[PDB]
Amino acid sequence: EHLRELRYRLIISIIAFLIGSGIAFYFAKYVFEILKEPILKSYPEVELITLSPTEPLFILIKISLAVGFIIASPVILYQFWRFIEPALYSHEKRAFIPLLLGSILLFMLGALFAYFIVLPLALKFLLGLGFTQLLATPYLSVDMYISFVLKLVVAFGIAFEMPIVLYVLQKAGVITPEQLASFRKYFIVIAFVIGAIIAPDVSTQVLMAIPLLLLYEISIFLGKL
């Protein structure tokens, strides 16, 4: 049953993600505008050329897949939450509703944080560091810039879900707040690994690790037992 439940809830979540991805595909040219907007306004001297051969569809498929996941985030959050509580951990179903709503708005606040705080900051640390206008002119590849935005935006959505899945595991006594306090020296490496994968330089790898450790230290404080 628990074996089969996942092998059906997965297919429902995967079915939702593709419906969401297809929607994202249709209005992708407009989503490409929202993404281009942060650079276009801050450093207009920086040209977004397509250094790539004939790959504006790869940029499309990346856009249709990442944005298709932010559309499906409410369905995916539900399939997680229903497979765990009241299913295994909690007991009340009107503790589940404020949990789903709370976790739906934590993925949205995560994406807004990346797009409106991490990213503009990540651009000043990259090309806004004084007179670096010479090494940044038709030097920007759109496939580079778009991807970094999509990585940063999706990672922060997910990174924000940590203090709820954690508070709920700590409450269900699956983990203790001291067990997170012991994993600190490993999450510092986790955060810098994630920061190495998604960020282009050290300045941005660090810029990313900071809110991640901060989200980890929010989970320990939600060690109210």
Ligand X SMILES: CCCCCCCCCCC(CCCCCCCCCC)(CO[C@H]1O[C@@H](CO)[C@H](O[C@@H]2O[C@@H](CO)[C@H](O)[C@@H](O)[C@@H]2O)[C@@H](O)[C@@H]1O)CO[C@H]1O[C@@H](CO)[C@H](O[C@@H]2O[C@@H](CO)[C@H](O)[C@@H](O)[C@@H]2O)[C@@H](O)[C@H]1O
For ligand X, the binding residues (CB under 6 A) are 23, 26-27, 29-30, 71
Please give the Cα distance from 187 to 183 (Å, whole number). Answer: 6
> Is the CB of 73 or the CB of 219 nearer to ligand X?
73
Q: How far is the CB of 190 from ligand X (least distance, A)?
A: 32
Please give the Cα distance from 163 to 217 (Å, whole number). Answer: 9
DSSP annotation string for 123-140: HHTTT-SSS-SSSSSTTE
Residue with tokens 């004939």: 54
Q: How far is the CB of 67 from ligand X (least distance, A)?
A: 8
Q: State which residue has the least CB distance to ligand X.
A: 30
> Is the CB of 23 or the CB of 104 nearer to ligand X?
23
Q: How far is the CB of 23 from ligand X (least distance, A)?
A: 5
> Is the CB of 67 or the CB of 159 nearer to ligand X?
67
Q: How far is the CB of 21 from ligand X (least distance, A)?
A: 11
Please state, as a whole number, how many other Cβ atoms lie within 10 Å of the Cβ of residue 180: 20
> Is the CB of 21 or the CB of 170 nearer to ligand X?
21
> Is the CB of 8 or the CB of 27 nearer to ligand X?
27
Question: What pairs with residue 164 in β-bridges?
Answer: none
CB 191 within 8 A of CB 212: yes
Mapping DSSP to helix (H, G, I), strand (E, B) and coil, where does residue 48 land?
A: strand
Mapping DSSP to helix (H, G, I), strand (E, B) and coil, where does residue 10 land?
A: helix
Q: How far is the CB of 71 from ligand X (least distance, A)?
A: 5
